[PDB]
Write an enzyme that holds these catalytic residues in place. Structure first.
Site, PDB file in Angstrom:
ATOM      1  N   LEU A 157       0.885  -1.149   0.103  1.00 17.28           N
ATOM      2  CA  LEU A 157      -0.092  -0.309  -0.137  1.00 17.28           C
ATOM      3  C   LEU A 157       0.952   1.242   0.071  1.00 17.28           C
ATOM      4  O   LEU A 157       1.930   1.246   0.766  1.00 17.28           O
ATOM      5  CB  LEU A 157      -0.782   0.101   1.132  1.00 17.28           C
ATOM      6  CG  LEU A 157      -2.208  -0.350   1.042  1.00 17.28           C
ATOM      7  CD1 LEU A 157      -2.779  -1.148  -0.015  1.00 17.28           C
ATOM      8  CD2 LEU A 157      -2.721  -1.093   2.351  1.00 17.28           C
ATOM      9  N   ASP A 158       0.472   2.258  -0.846  1.00 16.40           N
ATOM     10  CA  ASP A 158       1.234   3.463  -0.865  1.00 16.40           C
ATOM     11  C   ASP A 158       1.087   4.260   0.387  1.00 16.40           C
ATOM     12  O   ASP A 158      -0.155   4.054   1.023  1.00 16.40           O
ATOM     13  CB  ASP A 158       0.910   4.277  -2.184  1.00 16.40           C
ATOM     14  CG  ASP A 158       1.426   3.697  -3.608  1.00 16.40           C
ATOM     15  OD1 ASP A 158       2.482   2.832  -3.354  1.00 16.40           O
ATOM     16  OD2 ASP A 158       0.675   3.745  -4.394  1.00 16.40           O
ATOM     17  N   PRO A 159       1.975   4.946   0.845  1.00 18.02           N
ATOM     18  CA  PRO A 159       2.054   5.758   2.146  1.00 18.02           C
ATOM     19  C   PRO A 159       0.933   6.624   2.382  1.00 18.02           C
ATOM     20  O   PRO A 159       0.163   6.561   3.617  1.00 18.02           O
ATOM     21  CB  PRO A 159       3.265   6.719   1.989  1.00 18.02           C
ATOM     22  CG  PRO A 159       4.182   6.002   1.157  1.00 18.02           C
ATOM     23  CD  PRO A 159       3.278   5.083  -0.103  1.00 18.02           C
ATOM     24  N   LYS A 160       0.042   7.209   1.283  1.00 20.24           N
ATOM     25  CA  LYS A 160      -1.190   7.863   1.765  1.00 20.24           C
ATOM     26  C   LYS A 160      -2.238   7.076   1.849  1.00 20.24           C
ATOM     27  O   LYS A 160      -3.462   7.351   1.948  1.00 20.24           O
ATOM     28  CB  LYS A 160      -1.384   8.882   0.503  1.00 20.24           C
ATOM     29  CG  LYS A 160      -0.601  10.351   0.752  1.00 20.24           C
ATOM     30  CD  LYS A 160      -0.812  11.427  -0.580  1.00 20.24           C
ATOM     31  CE  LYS A 160      -0.094  10.728  -1.945  1.00 20.24           C
ATOM     32  NZ  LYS A 160      -0.151  11.725  -3.227  1.00 20.24           N
ATOM     33  N   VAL A 161      -2.184   5.710   1.700  1.00 22.63           N
ATOM     34  CA  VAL A 161      -3.263   4.684   1.611  1.00 22.63           C
ATOM     35  C   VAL A 161      -3.443   3.935   2.794  1.00 22.63           C
ATOM     36  O   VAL A 161      -2.415   3.599   3.424  1.00 22.63           O
ATOM     37  CB  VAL A 161      -2.848   3.789   0.240  1.00 22.63           C
ATOM     38  CG1 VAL A 161      -4.277   2.820   0.289  1.00 22.63           C
ATOM     39  CG2 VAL A 161      -2.940   4.458  -1.116  1.00 22.63           C
TER      40      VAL A 161
END
EC number: 5.4.99.25
Lengths: 52, 75, 328
Positions: free
Chosen positions: C74-78
């Site tokens: 998962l990408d950091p903002k997710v």
RNA sequence: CGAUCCACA
RNA sequence: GUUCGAUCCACAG
């Protein structure tokens, strides 16, 4: 912000579950400090809502 | 001469968008019916059977190509 | 309208007289807490902020694990479903990576578009869609495509669109959104993104936050209470719940854990519709995960044949000593 | 010899 | 997908 409805589970942009009438909270969980500065603190009141 | 289709619209991001029934390769050259250079394929996307195509207009004013049928040119 | 995981396979019985010794192995349910951990997966709800690796890294340090890993980045903002396999179960993430995912997305449009059109264009994108455009070739090349199993638009307020999407592993929602925006002219981008499903793991009672996870763990080390921490950790079997299964008999288990491939005669029962080359979970008759492997036969061949190699064992998870050496 | 388990590019 | 350890060399009757 993507909101979530605590009763129906339903996902929404709105402040009031259009399927369960309830007030909605943000879908994302809360930030976590890796050194968890105030963990023994959070744990202190947690123990008293689970009966520990 | 490989008919792409009609230019649906000019997208704000600066791309002519055509819906078509095949898959152009990246960087294929694109021409009009009178056979003139219009731009290059920069993205293909959507349903494989009926892709959208994004063309970078190498021409002064592109907004005038909507409604126009564009073609790919092998050689 | 649902992922492939969700389709239930049929179970073919090969040896209807097969039985299992209760003395051998350990059903997930009756595993001792320390062992439970050693073979566990956490259905974690990752917070906006950290990288998936940092999250795991923290879990390692805080629980004092020698190793762990996550089941799809998962990408950091997710935020959302981030399965974290621990210790000896760590490698099970291999069964997760291929697995179908579900997200809830917020698209912000760069101009104004009617809703009738937003709905219509968005359904063009259900099905097999093109990811990377091909490159100029002198020969018929492979074309990169991913499947979008469903797009369900939840609600629309103005330029902001909220939808639920189910996809094949390797599909970037950021990219889907850009492409959709391009198809509506005005353009678009991804405001917010939450993961609601990763193969077998979903937003249910087992989904736990970093806060609860650590708190429950302290409730065990300090307060002598194992119930909460146990609930936070799932049997690695869960991680393998969407894969086709071959259930072997007890006579075959130690052979597999000692590096034999699974031969046809060791088979008690299997899922229908296994193709050669598919990822299969080899299970004990008590439903323990013994190992992952590639199928060298079809469900049919496995069923009908009487000898041969059914499955090439690739990763072994079960300890060499839970079942006795019964071969030769 | 070959598989599997463990450690290191 | 390549280096020496550990276990085995197993068609599961």
């Amino acid at each position: 912000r993507i909101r979530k409805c605590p009763k129906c589970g339903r996902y929404t942009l709105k402040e009031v579950c259009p399927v369960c009438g309830e007030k909605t909270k943000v879908a994302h969980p809360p930030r976590f400090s890796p050194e968890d500065p105030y963990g023994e603190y959070r744990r202190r009141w947690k123990r008293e809502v689970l009966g520990i | 001469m490989k008919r792409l289709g009609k230019v649906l619209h000019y997208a704000k991001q600066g791309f002519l968008i055509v819906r078509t029934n095949w898959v152009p390769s990246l960087n294929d050259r694109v021409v009009d019916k009178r056979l003139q250079f219009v731009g290059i394929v920069k993205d293909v996307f959507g349903p494989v059977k009926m892709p959208y195509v994004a063309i970078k207009p190498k021409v002064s004013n592109p907004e005038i190509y909507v409604g126009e049928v564009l073609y790919v040119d092998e050689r | 309208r649902i992922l492939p995981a969700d389709i239930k396979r049929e179970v073919l019985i090969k040896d209807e007289n097969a039985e299992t010794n209760p003395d051998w192995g350990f059903p997930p349910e009756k595993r001792p807490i320390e062992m439970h951990i050693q073979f566990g997966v956490i259905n974690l709800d990752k917070p906006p902020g950290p990288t998936s690796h940092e999250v795991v890294a923290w879990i390692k340090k805080i629980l004092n694990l020698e190793k762990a890993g996550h089941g799809g980045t998962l990408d950091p903002k997710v935020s959302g479903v981030l399965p974290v396999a621990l210790e000896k179960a760590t490698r099970v993430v291999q069964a997760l990576l291929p697995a179908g995912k579900e997200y809830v997305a917020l698209m912000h449009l760069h101009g104004d578009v009617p809703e009738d059109k937003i709905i219509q264009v968005m359904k063009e994108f259900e099905g097999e869609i093109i990811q990377r455009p091909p490159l100029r070739s002198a020969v018929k090349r492979r074309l990169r495509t991913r499947k979008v199993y469903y797009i369900e638009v939840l609600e629309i307020e103005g330029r902001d669109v909220l939808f639920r999407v189910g996809v094949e592993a390797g599909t970037y929602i950021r990219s889907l959104i850009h492409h959709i925006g391009l198809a509506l002219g005005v353009g678009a981008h991804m405001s917010e993104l939450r993961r609601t499903r990763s193969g077998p793991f979903k937003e249910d009672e087992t989904l736990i936050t970093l806060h609860d996870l650590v708190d429950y763990y302290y409730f065990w080390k300090e307060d002598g209470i194992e119930e909460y921490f146990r609930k936070a950790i799932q049997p690695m079997e869960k991680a393998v719940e969407h894969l086709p299964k071959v259930w072997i008999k007890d006579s075959a288990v130690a052979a597999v854990t000692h590096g034999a491939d699974l031969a046809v005669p060791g088979i008690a029962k299997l899922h229908a519709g296994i193709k050669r080359g598919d990822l299969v979970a080899i299970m004990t008759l008590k439903d323990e995960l013994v190992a992952l492997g590639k199928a060298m036969m079809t469900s049919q061949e496995m069923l009908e044949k009487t000898k041969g190699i059914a499955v090439d064992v690739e990763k072994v998870f079960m300890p060499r000593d839970w079942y006795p050496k019964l071969w030769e």
